[PDB]
Chains A and B, each alone.
Chain A
Amino acid sequence: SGIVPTLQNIVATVTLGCRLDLKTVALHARNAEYNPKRFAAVIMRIREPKTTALIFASGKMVVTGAKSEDDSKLASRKYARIIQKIGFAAKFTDFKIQNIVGSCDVKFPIRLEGLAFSHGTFSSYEPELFPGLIYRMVKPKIVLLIFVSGKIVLTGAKQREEIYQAFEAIYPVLSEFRKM
C-alpha cells in the first residue's frame, strides 16, 4: 500500500447566461475552431493555461486542460472574457468540475482477462479493439483504464476524493488478479 493517484487534468462546465453566434464567435475569436461536421459549437484554446474549451450557442460551455480547481477557474475566466472582449455579453457563472483525471502505477502488471472474468458485470475488455481494460467503478461512478503495463487511469470523478477512492476500490481487485 502506498501509491495514491496523481491528478493529470480536470474538466468543468461554465455558462455565459447569454446566447452567442458561433459563426461570429469563431470569426471574432483569435483562437477558435468551428466544425459543422462534428457538432454545433465553437472550440476556443489558450496557452495560459494551456487548455481547450468548447462553447455552445446556448451560452453553456465546457473547459478542460486544467490540473486542479484554481487551474480551471483561471482557464474559464479567460474563455468567458474572449466573448466579452469580442463584444458579446457572456458572463462567468455555473462553473463546476464534473470530471477529474488522475493516473498511477500499481508497480505490477495485471491480468486484463482476469479482471473481466471476475467483474464481467462491470468491467469491460475488447481484445479486438482495446487491449486495455475499462472498469466502471459503481460508487463513485468512474472509468479506470488498466493495461498489463500497470498504468491505471481514473477519469469521470467529481471530486479529488472520488479519484482517490476509485483507486482504493479497484486497487485490491487488481492485486487480486495481478499478472506477475
Chain B
Amino acid sequence: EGSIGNGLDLTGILFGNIDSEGRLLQDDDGEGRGGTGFDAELRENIGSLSKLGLDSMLLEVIDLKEA
C-alpha cells in the first residue's frame, strides 16, 4: 500500500526556479517572442528530462523521502 519511487520532479528546479509541481520560471520577465530564456524546446523537455541524467539532480533538490 504505497508508491514506487518517492520524491518530486525537480528536473526544472535546478534548471531555473520552478514550482515543484513542474512549472519552470525565470527571475526576470520577457514579453517578446524570443529573448533571454529558453524557448519551448526545454520546458516541455524538462518534464521528461528525468530519463537521461537529470534524474540525479532531480532528487538532489527535494529530499522529500524522510517524513
Contacts and interface: CB of A to CB of B under 8 A. Distances in A.
Contacts, number: 119
Nearest to A45: B19
B41 interface: yes
How many chain B residues sit at the interface, stated as a range, is 35 or more
A16 interface: no
Given A52-B25, A64-B13, A134 B63 contact: no
Contacts of B64: 39-41, 56
B8 A156 contact: no
A155 B14 contact: yes
A105 B47 CA distance: 24
Nearest to B7: A39
B41 A131 contact: yes
Given A51-B27, A155-B14, A134 B52 contact: yes
Given A11-B13, A38-B9, A156-B57, A64 B62 contact: no
Contact of A52 (B9, B17, B57): B17
Interface residues of A, number: 45
Contacts of B21: 33, 35, 38, 43
- Give the dominant DSSP class at A's interface: strand
A89 interface: no
A81 B60 CA distance: 24
Contacts of B45: 129-130, 132
A49 interface: yes
A109 to B, nearest CB: 14
A129 B48 contact: yes
B25 A65 contact: yes
Contacts of A25: none
A147 B8 CA distance: 27
A35 B20 contact: yes
Contacts of B17: 9, 50-52, 64-65
Contacts of B28: 50
Interface string B38-59: 1001100100110111101100
